[PDB]
Structures are given as C-alpha cells and as structure tokens.
Paper text:
Type IV-A [name]-Cas systems diverge from this general mechanism, using a nuclease-independent interference pathway to suppress gene expression for gene regulation and plasmid competition. Here, we present several cryo-EM structures of two evolutionary distant type IV-A1 and type IV-A3 complexes (from [name] and Klebsiella pneumoniae, respectively) bound to cognate DNA targets with and without DinG. The structures reveal multisubunit DNA-surveillance complexes that intimately recognize their DNA-targets to form an R-loop structure. Our results support a model in which DNA-binding is achieved analogously to type I Cascade, while recruitment of DinG differs mechanistically, even in closely related subtypes.
Residue numbers in the entry:
A (entry chain M): 1 to 229
B (entry chain D): 1 to 220, 235 to 345
C (entry chain C): 175 to 222, 237 to 345
D (entry chain B): 175 to 222, 236 to 345
Amino acid sequence: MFVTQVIFNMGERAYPDRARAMVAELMDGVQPGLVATLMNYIPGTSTSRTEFPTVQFGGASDGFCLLGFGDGGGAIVRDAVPLIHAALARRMPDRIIQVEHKEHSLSAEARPYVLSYTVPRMVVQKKQRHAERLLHEAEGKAHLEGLFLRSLQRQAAAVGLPLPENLEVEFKGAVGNFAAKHNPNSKVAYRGLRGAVFDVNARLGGIWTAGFMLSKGYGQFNATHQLSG
Amino acid sequence: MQIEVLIRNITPIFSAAPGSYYVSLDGTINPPQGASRFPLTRARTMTVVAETGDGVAKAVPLPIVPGNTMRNLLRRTMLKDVIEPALRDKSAQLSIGAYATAYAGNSSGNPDGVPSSFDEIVTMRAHPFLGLFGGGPRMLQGRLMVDSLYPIHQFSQRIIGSDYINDSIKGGITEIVWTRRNDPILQLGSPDDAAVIEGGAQAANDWITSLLATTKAKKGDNGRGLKAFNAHEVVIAGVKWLWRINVDRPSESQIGLILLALNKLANQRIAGGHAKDYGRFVIEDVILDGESVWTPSGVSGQATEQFFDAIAEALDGMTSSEFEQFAASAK
Amino acid sequence: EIVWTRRNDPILQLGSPDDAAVIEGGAQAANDWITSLLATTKAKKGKAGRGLKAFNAHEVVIAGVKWLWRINVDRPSESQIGLILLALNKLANQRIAGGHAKDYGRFVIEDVILDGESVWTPSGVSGQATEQFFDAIAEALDGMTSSEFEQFAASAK
Amino acid sequence: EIVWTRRNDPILQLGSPDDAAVIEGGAQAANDWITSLLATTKAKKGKANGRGLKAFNAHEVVIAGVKWLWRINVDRPSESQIGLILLALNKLANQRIAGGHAKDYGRFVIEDVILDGESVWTPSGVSGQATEQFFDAIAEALDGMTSSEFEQFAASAK
RNA sequence: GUGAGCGGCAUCCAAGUUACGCAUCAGAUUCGAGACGCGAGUAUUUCCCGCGCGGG
C-alpha cells in the first residue's frame, strides 16, 4: 500500500514530456534492464504494456516527480533513483540536483459523507471513433465517471487494495479547457479540461490518478495534500 | 553540620536518565507500536513515597538531580575556583595522578586494599579538601554527605519536610523539548553557495548520491547520516529546589571552603544541556544549622567570618604535598 | 529503585591550556595519559590495571517508607533501659547503612513503643513513665569507670 | 535463606584525634595497632599467629513467617503434669526457639494448641472448661511442691 | 521333639555465645519543525496493445 514519490530539483521548472524524453535519453546509456523497467517497456521491445503502468512521471515546482505505484513500482523507483540522479548530475554540471524521498501510505475508505475532489487536468479522448462517443456532453458525462471509477478500480487492483463496493462518483463541473499532445511529432491534440471537480462517496488517501496513458504524468492529483470539503 | 541550600533554576535542568525511551509526536511516552516513535531522553527521576491528599502513601516518580552529580559540582567548584588559584599563587603543581585523585577521588580503578596509618588518616581528614571528600588508593571516609537536589513539590514533602511548603508546586514540572538536525548539503540549492566545497556541485551531488545509495535499504548502521528528529525531557524552568549538605564534624577551614564554594556555585551549571545553556540556577537561601547565612552579596555576615578566616589561613599555607601523599599508592 | 552512577576521567574533561597549567609536565603529561588510555582500551578491546571511566548502578530503597525496628531486652536494669532510651533520643543523628557520600540512610523516628506504651514526644523520649530510666542511667554514668571495660577485655589466658 | 555477617576493626574507623582521645596512648597506640595489623596481613598473604577483627562470613536461617508443627506426647500423665505442660505452653512464646540471641532470632507466636485431637487454645492462651482440672491440679501441686523431692532425686548413692 | 526351647540396648542430655557490606565515583559531550503538489500547451489521427468497443 506504498507509493514512492521522489522529487528532483533541477533548478528550472521542467515539462513532463520533455523530462520524460530527457531521462529516456539519459537512461539509454545505462543498463538496459533498468531502462525498460523504468519506462514500462518489455525487455527487448519498446511497446507500452496493457497492464496498469506502475512507474510514471509528473511535474514539480522546480523539476519532475517520480510516482511509483504499488509495492513493485515503489521498489523500482527506490533502486532507480541513485542512477538517474547520477545521470542528472553528469548532464547538468552547472546546477546542483537535490533529492528528497517521500514514502506515502495508500488507502481508500468509504464514508456516508459525500467528499468533493478537484483535478487540475483531465483527458477524455483518445480516438476519433471514441470522439464520436464524445461528440456531446450527454454521452460525455457517463464516460467521465465511468473513467474515474475504472481508473480507481485499476489502481486498487494493481496495488492490491480493496475498494468500497458501494462507491458512487459524480462529476460536478468544469472551469477551463486545454489540449493533450502525446508526441512532439504528433499533430493531434487530445481533449483536455482544466479545473475539473467531482463528488465521490469515499475518503481518498495517498495519491490517485485518472485519465489515460499513465506513462506521462497528466491527470494526477494528491488526495492527501488536497484536504477535503 | 546541616546545610540546606534553596536553589531556583532560571533555565531548565536536563539530567538525562540512562536508557532508550521513545515518544510519539503528541508527547505520548512509550507509544504503542505502529505510529511514529522518536527517541526520548528522559529526565532523571527517583521514585519516592508521597501523599497525594488522600492520606495514603504511594510511590511516585520525582524528577531530581542525582546526588553524585551535585557532589561533583561542589568538588569542581571548590577546586577550579578556590584551591586551584591558591595552588597557582604559590606556583605549586599537582602530579597527573594527584590531579586525577583530586578531581575524581582516585587515579586508577584498582583500590589499594590496605588500610592507612592513623597519622595519615588524621592528616587527610584535617585537610580542607581531601577531608571533605576522601577516597584515594586506600579508601578514606570523607566528611561530606551531599544529598540529591529535590524539587520543592507536593511529592517531596514527605522527604524535605513542610518548612518550604510555600514554594511547593502541585502539577508536573517536566516538559518534552524537540530537537532536530537538518543536513547541511541538503540546504544547498545554488551553485555559488558551494563555492567553498572542493569541487562544489560535483562533490555535493556525489555526497547526496551516496546518501541515496545508503537510503535505498528500508527493511530486510554504519554511516547513519546527518539527519535526526528526536526529543528530550527537561525539568521546567523556575522550579525551586532544596539541596541538603551534611558534614561530619568539620573544622572551620572546611566550613569556610564549603561556604566559598556556595558563593561561587552559581558560576557553574548543574547538569547537562551545555550546548543549550541548561542548568543555570541562582541560590535563593543558604541555611547553616537552622540559621540563614545568605545575604544578597552571598554568604557573609559576622556569623560566618570565622569560617572564612580559617579557610583563608589554610589556603595561604596550602601545598601540593598533601595531595601527593593522598594520591600515593602503597602497593 | 536503581540509581545509575558514573565516574569520569578528569583528563578527558581537561581541554584548556589553563586547566593543565596545574599539572606537572603540563600538556605533555595529559597527552601521555590520554594516549596510554587509548592504547590500553585498544588492547583490551582486541584481546576480548583499570582506567577511571566507569558506569555502574546501585539499588536503593526509596525515600519515605516506614520501618519497624524491634528491640527486645531480657530482664534489664533501670540503667540499661535508660541507656537504650538515651541512644534512641540521639539515634536520628546517625545514618542507618551505606551511602555516606550520597547522604543515604537518613531517617526520622515516628514513634517509640515501650512495652505497648508510646513514649515518643515531639522532643524525644519524654514523660514521667521514662523518668526513672533516665535518672538511673545518669547515676550509672556518673559512676562509670573504665575498670569494668578493662576487666571485660582482659584475656583469661 | 542465607544471611551475611561482617566484623570490623574499630581502630580503622578512627579519623580524628578526638576519637582516639579516649584510647590510652591515643594516636601512638592506634598507629601501633594498625602497623601490627598491616604486618600480620602481609605475613598471612605471603604464607598462602593471632587473628584480627576483620571477618566476613554467612549463616543460614529459616525464613520468617513459616508455620511449624510441634508434637508433644506424654506417657499416661497425672493431671498435675498436664497442667504443668499447659502452663509452659501458655508462657512459651516469651521464650525463643534456638540460637541467634544478638539478631533476635527464634521469636515465634503460638497459633493453635491441640490436646488429644481437640483445640484448647484461645486468644488469651490455653484455656477453656476442658483444661480446668489440669490447671487446678498443677496449682495444688505447686502449692505443695518443696525442694525435698529435687534434693532426693539429685542425691547420689555413692 | 532344628545344642532346640525362653530373653527390650534401654534409660537421661540446648550447638550455643559474640561480630556494620562498608568506604570512594558528573549521564556527560553534538545537531533549524522547516521544507515539499502542477493555470507547462491545438483540433481530430500514426505506428499498435487487447480480439463493433476498452487504450500509448
């Protein structure tokens, strides 16, 4: 029930995707086993795994953050930080990279009270045939709480955490919209919504995630530091 | 010769109790396993029998300063402030063994095992310093009965008495003080900060990489690392204490020596917390066989002038020969 | 209760040139002492005369407990009872056992029971019931000579 | 239980000329005593004929508070003899069972006295209606007792 | 009917007196509750993982 969060203070605030590319280039030199383990690539290939990715990325005020879900992903992050830190030190000799490790406890429990949660960035579209289902909010809303519940169940199963069988998550409203871009060469921008708020009948602990393509660092939110309503 | 010294500490007293104790983040001493448990250095306590107002007697822990600590405080005051200057004025030097015997009662851990001649016994027991404390190779009985420092509390009334019932405190007099330790390198965030370090950024990054390497092991030592959050327990400030000194038939020189030490006692801290200025106290009253000889200028008045004259006369004719004979091993 | 006692090495606490100014040889003697201590410690640890540093414990009865002391005499004279009561009047001036350095053994008498009768006053053993004992022992002391002690201690062979 | 006992040389606890003032000769006598003690101790250590006053030994005792059974049988006694035994039992607790006079050893209290399967012990002592005849008989015997019987018993034929 | 038959080692007695586990010994030296959660990036499809639909 442990999710290991590691913060790298590059000195300059870093993009998620740019950080992913930079570390992938840096990892490419070092032992390939750790490389393929880190970016969830099958040994010998470069394919994204069907199963819930456990090691992912994320932004920070002065760098990028490592989020290793589950016991296995936490262990991978724990024995991978020294090598990536050494690589970062080698790559930037003009700045001092500093690392602090925060090992969190992950748990989720149900309460009769309705708990309101906010997510900064949301992605709800992958393919145009799926966007045909997203053509209007009438079909969009069901897809929304469906995605939230599916993501919660997926991460609970991946970390082996029992989840309240009587959950009812309800999307509340929207504030802003953005665009999600998978690769620099890709012209397609996926759907993106900012200031998303939803109601859930459970007290969420640790850090949870929702959206698509966990391996970049979008759609993340810390339930612990967000308090509640 | 009964001496009762009233002591009020203007800083907390920290006499650490031996052993490893753990405290939670909310002050729970020895908290149940599972929650955060930080090490706690408890304050010295002595279980004593006391009445809590219900008329029955029960053993309760009373935070004290151990009597041996106070005896050594008196010895160090006398030496460093009265006898060492007296020997330096005559340019007299104590040998290394004599210095060890004067400062700790003996020079080695192996006692001689044989008695001393009666002439030697009377010579040392008449000495202003060695008579008070004694010890040495051939173990000698000192004239000084130095007791522990007892706070004036409702729990010590069965011990100290009810004479000082006006200074008593009913509640607890201990407090948890939380200390930390941040890593110096972990505070470095800019390249110009580490310009003094050999290699600067490279050395700092290597050191933190080593820290991460030694931190990877959580569960299944050497190089623990400069990081800690522990706590210690201190007797709170302002509490009034009682120190009782009994002396077995002293000469006036020895009483004058003790009075001089009491005059210069406030210049030395009681116990522990040197780094944190703990142990600072002021003497509020000195009672010599039921009479108060304490003045705002210290121990003065015509009631104690003979003691000061005797100790001054003894110091003006004091040589290292007595200490050398006392510390000499007969085996 | 358990009291933890510690003994320090004065030279280890000696860390100023003025502190060693009183020692013969000055800093050289202290350095020799410290290095000899280090050598002895290393030899003893490797091996698997004793230095000054120590850490012990001694176990004491807590302060404030009441005790009962039973003194029985078979067919005593008035002078002997008077002597016992005189000793009990001045008994609190002496310590019971052990811990002279640390002022252990101090006590106060709460009551003295004399064949079922309490003869303890706030100012000691006083009262008409004890007057004859004190008078008899005073007379005996006024008539006390060393000849009895010398005759008692003289060997018969 | 085992009790440890010590003996001390009094001259070794002298610490002032006042303590030795009562001693004839005084400091000289104390010094002579201590010198003789040191010489004797060195001789005994080397040899390993007077003995000093320093002693450390132990003696073994039965712990306090344990209950004991004492069985007394008498071969067809007269009522005077039974009454005498009962009186001795009544005044027995004032005595002490065995050695240890200095340390007040041997003190006890009688809890129950059983006389031919029946309890005859009261808080006051051996009493009751069943013991009246014995006490009256022993009182009469004491009133009529004289030294003539003892003198005749102790007299030797030759 | 065995050199058999018959036959009380029994009575009385104090292990007791005297004796300090005591003298001497700093729980001391160092260290911040003050740091850590994104307003980071375009328009509609591209190699593919499970098999209309889930999803790099």
